[PDB]
Amino acid sequence: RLLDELTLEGVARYMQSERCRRVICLVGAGISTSAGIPDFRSPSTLEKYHLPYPEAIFEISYFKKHPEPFFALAKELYPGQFKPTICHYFMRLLKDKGLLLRCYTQNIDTLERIAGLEQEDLVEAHGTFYTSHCVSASCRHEYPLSWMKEKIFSEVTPKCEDCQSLVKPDIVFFGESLPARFFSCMQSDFLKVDLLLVMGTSLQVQPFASLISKAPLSTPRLLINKEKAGQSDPFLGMGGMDFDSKKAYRDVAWLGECDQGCLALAELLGWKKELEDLVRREHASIDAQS
Ligand SMILES: Cc1cc(C)nc(SCC(=O)Nc2cccc(COc3ccc(NC(=O)c4cnn(C)c4)c(I)c3)c2)n1
Ligand SMILES: [Zn+2]
Q: Transmembrane stretches, by residue range?
């Protein structure tokens, strides 16, 4: 087995060994809650529009004929600031140290890009608000977030300047496929991965969650999350996480806030001062633009 013990300390020693060259991060809403971006799937965080069923506001067919409810929600959920968390900057340190193979994110908040991850390092599995596109097949004019934000706050349904068709944020609506990029990167990246770092996701959304089963059998998998996640469901179960059985050999659960877990791991790696300096610098820069 590649980990000398099933602890954060064991993962840190593995990461500092010659065996650990290529890290894949799988991240969800839990890496952005400390940035003041609620998880839209969280129960703790629209009747006038007459939605056939609640989830119709995120369904492609309904949105194309009735986009008003979605854009009204977009203005209400629009964050007041885009300040990446310690977890986001930890992934930037992975990139800087030549350890980041890829970051697969289920988030659409663009914090990975703001923290310094480039398009090549990223797989936005559920799409993103970073870019928007006219929905007309013969046009597909691309619009930046600055353009889409103005339309969202003005309460003007965004229309293409070339053909007057609806302009849709590049998020994956229900009824749309995950991007081709997701499947092609998964097919290549999971041949090469030395460590799977799973942070701030309950691994309940498919097919994203199934990525953990694409890791080679030897590849250590560290979960940094408020709750244990990724174990086979005893009912549905009739390559899940095994943290706590006598057969456990490679899966580690660090239970707490993603920021606290990434700080703890950075500290073990001798990166704590580097991470503090990077976060304080970027936070200062963002605060001065805000
Ligand atoms: C407006 C804005 C801009 C920026 C840059 N950040 C933010 S962060 C705050 C926020 O949550 N905003 C927000 C607003 C309106 C709607 C939504 C809903 O977003 C999404 C996204 C993807 C998905 N897709 C999946 O999950 C998924 C999976 N399989 N399939 C097939 C789809 C869904 I469903 C909903 C979010 N907000
Ligand atoms: Zn157009």
A: none
Q: What's the CA gap between 49 and 69, in Å, rounded?
A: 6
Give the right CATH number for 8-37+84-126+178-289 from 3.50.30.20, 3.40.50.11540, 3.40.50.1220, 3.40.1260.20.
3.40.50.1220
Which three-class secondary structure state does DSSP give residue 101?
Answer: strand
Q: Is 153 in the pocket of ligand 1 (CB under 6 A)?
A: no
Active-site residue flag, 141: no
CATH code given to domain 47-78+131-171: 3.30.1600.10
Helices (H), 97-139: 111-114
40 in Cβ contact with 212 (< 8 Å): no
The four Cα atoms 76, 198, 6, 271 give a dihedral, to 10 degrees, of -80
- ∠ Cα 231 236 239 (to 5°): 40
Token pair 């006219």 in the structure block, residue: 134
Q: Where are the chain's structural domains?
A: 8-37+84-126+178-289, 47-78+131-171
What distances in angstroms separate CA 149 from CA 84, 170, 177, one per listed residue?
A: 19, 13, 25
Q: If DSSP codes are grouped into helix, strand and coil, which group holds residue 147? A: helix
Q: Is 79 in the pocket of ligand 1 (CB under 6 A)?
A: yes
